[PDB]
Chains A and B, each alone.
Chain A
Amino acid sequence: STELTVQSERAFQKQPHIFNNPKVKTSKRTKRWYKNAGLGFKTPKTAIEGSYIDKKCPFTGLVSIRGKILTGTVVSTKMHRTIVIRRAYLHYIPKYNRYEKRHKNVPVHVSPAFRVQVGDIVTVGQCRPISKTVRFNVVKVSAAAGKANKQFAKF
Chain B
Amino acid sequence: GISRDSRHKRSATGAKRAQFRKKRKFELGRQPANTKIGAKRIHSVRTRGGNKKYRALRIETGNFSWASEGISKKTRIAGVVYHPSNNELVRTNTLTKAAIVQIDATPFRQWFEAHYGQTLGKKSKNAERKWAARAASAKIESSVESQFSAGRLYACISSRPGQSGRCDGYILEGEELAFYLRRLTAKK
Q: Do chains A and B touch in the complex (CB under 8 A)?
A: yes
Contact call A14/B68, Cβ cutoff below 8 A = no
Q: Determine the chain A residues whose CB is within 8 A of the CB of B175 once the complex forms.
A: 12, 30
Complex interface bits, A116-155 against B, C-beta within 8 A gives 1, otherwise 0? 0000000000000000110000000000000000000000
B176 interfacial contact with A, CB 8 Å: yes
In the complex, the answer to whether A132 meets B12 with C-beta atoms within 8 Å is: yes
| Known contacts A7-B179, A12-B176, A132 near B85 by CB under 8 Å | no
Q: Main secondary structure on chain B at its contact with chain A?
A: loop
Interface size on A, residues (CB 8 A): 15
Known interface pairs A9-B84, A11-B84; A19-B137 also in contact (CB < 8 Å): no
Question: A12 touching B180 by the CB < 8 A rule?
Answer: yes
What are the interface flags for B97-140 relative to A under an 8 Å C-beta threshold, 1 for contact and 0 otherwise? 01000000000000000000000000000000000000001011
Shortest B173–chain A CB gap in Å is 6
CA distance A14 to B84 in the complex (A): 14
CB < 8 Å A-B pair total: 30
Contacts A9-B84, A11-B84 given: A22-B174 contact, CB under 8 Å?
yes
Q: Are A23 and B68 in contact (CB under 8 A)?
A: yes
Residue from A9, A23, A30, A107 having most chain B Cβ neighbours under 10 A:
A23
Please give the number of chain B residues whose Cβ is less than 8 angstroms from any Cβ of chain A in the complex.
Answer: 19
Taking the closest CB of chain A, its distance from the CB of B40, in whole angstroms, is 28
In the complex, what residue of chain B is closest to A13 when comparing beta carbons? B179
Please tell me if A95 contacts chain B, counting CB pairs below 8 Å: no
> CB distance A133 to B68 under 8 Å?
no
Mask of B163-179 contacts with A, CB within 8 angstroms, 1/0: 00000000001111001
Distance in Å: Cβ of B8 to nearest Cβ of chain A? 12
Which chain A positions have C-beta within 8 A of B180? Answer: 12
Give 1 or 0 for each of A1-36: 1 = CB within 8 Å of chain B CB. Answer: 000000101111010000111110000001000000
Known contacts A22-B68, A22-B173, A23-B139: A10-B12 contact under CB 8 Å? no
Q: A21-B68, A22-B68, A133-B12 are in contact. Are A10 and B137 (CB under 8 A)?
A: no
* B141 interface residue per 8 A CB criterion: yes
Chain A residues contacting B141 (CB-CB under 8 Å) are 22
B67 at the A interface (CB under 8 A): yes
Query: Is the C-beta of B6 less than 8 angstroms from some C-beta in chain A?
Result: yes
- A7, A10, A14: the one contacting B85 at CB < 8 Å is A10
Residues of chain B touching chain A, judged by Cβ–Cβ distance below 8 Å, are 6, 9, 12, 67-68, 84-85, 98, 137, 139-141, 173-176, 179-180, 183
15 contacts between A and B (CB under 8 A): A9-B84, A10-B84, A10-B183, A12-B175, A12-B179, A19-B67, A21-B68, A22-B141, A22-B173, A23-B137, A23-B139, A23-B140, A30-B175, A107-B12, A132-B12
